[PDB]
Amino acid sequence: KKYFMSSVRRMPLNRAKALCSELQGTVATPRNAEENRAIQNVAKDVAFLGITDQRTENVFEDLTGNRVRYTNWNEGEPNNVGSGENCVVLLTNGKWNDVPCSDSFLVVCEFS
Amino acid sequence: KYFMSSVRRMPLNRAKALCSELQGTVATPRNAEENRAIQNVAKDVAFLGITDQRTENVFEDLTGNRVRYTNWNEGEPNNVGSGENCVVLLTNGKWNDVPCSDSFLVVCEFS
Ligand SMILES: CC(=O)N[C@@H]1[C@@H](O)[C@H](O)[C@@H](CO)O[C@@H]1O
Numbered sequence: 001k002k003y004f005m006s007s008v009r010r011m012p013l014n015r016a017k018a019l020c021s022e023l024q025g026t027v028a029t030p031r032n033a034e035e036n037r038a039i040q041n042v043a044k045d046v047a048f049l050g051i052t053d054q055r056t057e058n059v060f061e062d063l064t065g066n067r068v069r070y071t072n073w074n075e076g077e078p079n080n081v082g083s084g085e086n087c088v089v090l091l092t093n094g095k096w097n098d099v100p101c102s103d104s105f106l107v108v109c110e111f112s
Numbered sequence: 113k114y115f116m117s118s119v120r121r122m123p124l125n126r127a128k129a130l131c132s133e134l135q136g137t138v139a140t141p142r143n144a145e146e147n148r149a150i151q152n153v154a155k156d157v158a159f160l161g162i163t164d165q166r167t168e169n170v171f172e173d174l175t176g177n178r179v180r181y182t183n184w185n186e187g188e189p190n191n192v193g194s195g196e197n198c199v200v201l202l203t204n205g206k207w208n209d210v211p212c213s214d215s216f217l218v219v220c221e222f223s
């Protein structure tokens with residue numbers, strides 16, 4: 001099964017990736033509602049998920065370049081505000097928001 | 113308990129920070145079964161969450177709890193050099209006390 005653990009500090013996506021990879025895990029990517037809720041259970045605040053549309057705008061992929069199927073976007077999202085929001089966070093209500101990859105948030109790592 | 117190993121080596125202070133970052137602690141085997149599980153996740157010598165820093169030759173976990181199960185390599189713990197207050201699990205599963213300032217892999221433990 002997948003196990004999810006939340007970080008204590010906030011950091012941008014690249015650091016988030018490095019943290020999870022240090023323990024041979026990856027940034028959490030919910031594949032269904034059950035997993036999305038499991039990630040919610042561990043994230044005490046807005047947290048990064050391992051999904052981006054960095055390759056092609058509005059085409060969301062997990063960190064291994066695999067296009068995602070399940071999505072749980074907050075109403076009005078993804079909106080790619082300003083100079084661009086190509087990373088994704090899980091809001092405190094479980095819904096998703098696209099945000100700048102350079103912004104800092106807690107990170108939830110996934111292991112199995 | 114879930115056990116995860118780091119890929120890079122680092123001293124105990126940094127090992128503790130890493131496990132603590134994800135709300136876990138440096139792995140402390142409480143029996144032979146956990147010892148084997150940790151050995152298997154670690155691909156090389158790795159730190160355990162046990163030290164005798166507070167009191168020499170009194171080994172306890174990172175929360176002050178004295179350890180009951182031990183699996184010391186023959187001749188250990190020996191506190192050689194200028195002192196060895198940290199502990200590593202060798203590639204054969206036995207333990208060796210080493211300087212806390214030295215760098216090894218780290219196996220983190222989560223509940
Ligand atoms: C940096 C950041 O979190 N910006 C968010 C944006 O992503 C979101 O789409 C918008 C509408 O809810 O609110 C904020 O502007």
Ligand SMILES: CC(=O)N[C@@H]1[C@@H](O)[C@H](O)[C@@H](CO)O[C@@H]1O
Binds near residue numbers: 192214
């Ligand atoms: C720094 C280090 O790993 N020293 C070890 C010491 O801990 C161990 O007791 C001894 C056993 O032969 O070998 C080495 O000297």
Ligand SMILES: [Ca+2]
Binds near residue numbers: 053057058080086098
């Ligand atoms: Ca985008």
Ligand SMILES: [Ca+2]
Binds near residue numbers: 080085097099
């Ligand atoms: Ca947005």
Ligand SMILES: [Ca+2]
Binds near residue numbers: 169195
């Ligand atoms: Ca000692």
Ligand SMILES: [Ca+2]
Binds near residue numbers: 209
């Ligand atoms: Ca020794």
Ligand SMILES: [Cl-]
Binds near residue numbers: 195196198211212213
């Ligand atoms: Cl020491």
